[PDB]
Short mmCIF file of C-alpha atoms in Angstrom, two decimals:
data_model
loop_
_atom_site.label_atom_id
_atom_site.label_comp_id
_atom_site.label_asym_id
_atom_site.label_seq_id
_atom_site.Cartn_x
_atom_site.Cartn_y
_atom_site.Cartn_z
CA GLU J 1 27.70 44.36 -1.88
CA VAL J 2 26.60 45.34 -5.36
CA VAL J 3 29.36 47.91 -5.80
CA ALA J 4 31.79 45.29 -4.53
CA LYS J 5 30.63 42.62 -7.00
CA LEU J 6 30.90 45.07 -9.92
CA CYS J 7 34.34 46.10 -8.67
CA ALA J 8 35.18 42.42 -8.44
CA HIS J 9 33.88 41.92 -11.97
CA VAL J 10 35.48 44.82 -13.86
CA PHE J 11 38.85 44.98 -12.17
CA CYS J 12 39.99 41.57 -10.94
CA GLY J 13 40.75 39.68 -14.13
CA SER J 14 43.48 38.58 -16.53
CA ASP J 15 44.12 38.69 -20.29
CA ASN J 16 40.41 38.46 -21.14
CA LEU J 17 37.47 39.93 -19.26
CA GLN J 18 34.14 40.09 -21.04
CA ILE J 19 32.87 43.18 -19.23
CA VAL J 20 29.64 42.64 -21.08
CA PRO J 21 28.50 39.30 -22.54
CA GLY J 22 29.77 40.06 -26.06
CA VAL J 23 32.84 42.28 -25.63
CA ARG J 24 36.16 40.86 -24.42
CA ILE J 25 38.98 43.08 -23.13
CA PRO J 26 42.57 41.84 -23.53
CA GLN J 27 45.38 43.00 -21.26
CA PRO J 28 48.30 45.05 -22.73
CA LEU J 29 50.38 43.82 -25.65
CA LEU J 30 54.07 42.98 -25.16
CA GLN J 31 54.88 45.76 -27.66
CA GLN J 32 53.35 48.20 -25.18
CA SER J 33 52.98 50.98 -27.73
CA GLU J 34 50.47 53.25 -26.03
CA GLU J 35 49.49 54.92 -29.30
CA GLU J 36 48.57 51.42 -30.46
CA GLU J 37 46.71 50.43 -27.29
CA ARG J 38 44.64 53.61 -27.46
CA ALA J 39 43.58 52.81 -31.03
CA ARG J 40 42.92 49.17 -30.07
CA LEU J 41 40.65 49.87 -27.13
CA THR J 42 39.05 52.66 -29.15
CA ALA J 43 38.53 50.20 -31.99
CA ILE J 44 36.91 47.61 -29.74
CA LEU J 45 34.31 50.21 -28.67
CA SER J 46 33.64 50.89 -32.37
CA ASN J 47 33.01 47.18 -32.99
CA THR J 48 30.47 47.17 -30.14
CA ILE J 49 26.68 47.51 -30.45
CA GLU J 50 24.70 47.89 -27.24
CA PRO J 51 21.91 45.22 -27.24
CA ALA J 52 18.20 45.76 -26.64
CA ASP J 53 18.10 44.03 -23.24
CA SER J 54 21.27 45.89 -22.31
CA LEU J 55 20.00 47.03 -18.92
CA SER J 56 19.50 43.36 -18.05
CA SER J 57 22.48 41.86 -19.91
CA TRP J 58 25.23 44.46 -19.41
CA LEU J 59 24.23 45.29 -15.86
CA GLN J 60 24.38 41.83 -14.36
CA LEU J 61 20.85 41.91 -12.89
CA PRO J 62 18.19 39.61 -14.37
CA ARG J 63 15.62 40.35 -17.09
CA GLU J 64 12.67 39.39 -14.91
CA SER J 65 13.50 42.40 -12.74
CA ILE J 66 13.78 45.01 -15.53
CA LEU J 67 10.32 43.91 -16.65
CA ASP J 68 9.13 44.58 -13.09
CA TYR J 69 10.63 48.05 -13.28
CA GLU J 70 8.89 48.71 -16.60
CA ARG J 71 5.68 47.23 -15.10
CA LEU J 72 6.37 49.41 -12.09
CA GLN J 73 6.74 52.78 -13.80
CA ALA J 74 3.60 51.98 -15.82
CA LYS J 75 1.79 51.44 -12.53
CA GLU J 76 2.82 54.92 -11.31
CA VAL J 77 1.59 56.62 -14.48
CA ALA J 78 -1.68 54.68 -14.59
CA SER J 79 -2.39 55.12 -10.87
CA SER J 80 -1.94 58.87 -11.27
CA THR J 81 -4.26 59.32 -14.25
CA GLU J 82 -6.80 56.99 -12.65
CA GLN J 83 -6.81 59.26 -9.60
CA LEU J 84 -6.94 62.43 -11.73
CA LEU J 85 -9.81 61.22 -13.90
CA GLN J 86 -11.77 59.96 -10.90
CA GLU J 87 -11.34 63.38 -9.30
CA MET J 88 -13.04 64.94 -12.36
#
């Protein structure tokens, strides 16, 4: 379902997209000069700055989850050293 909803997001669309909350992607100019489209889409990546919350904002899943993942990896590390220290 997830793959489908990202496929639905990135591909189905017209004349503006907003793949990620800040960055909009227009569909090809009437001029259709490919040398120009390459520089344009290259340019629009150069005007981009990936945010801090990017894993939550750019990947459509919520922030509350990411925080759980961060909380979660911390739990693995801390469980491990608790067990190691208790063993010695």
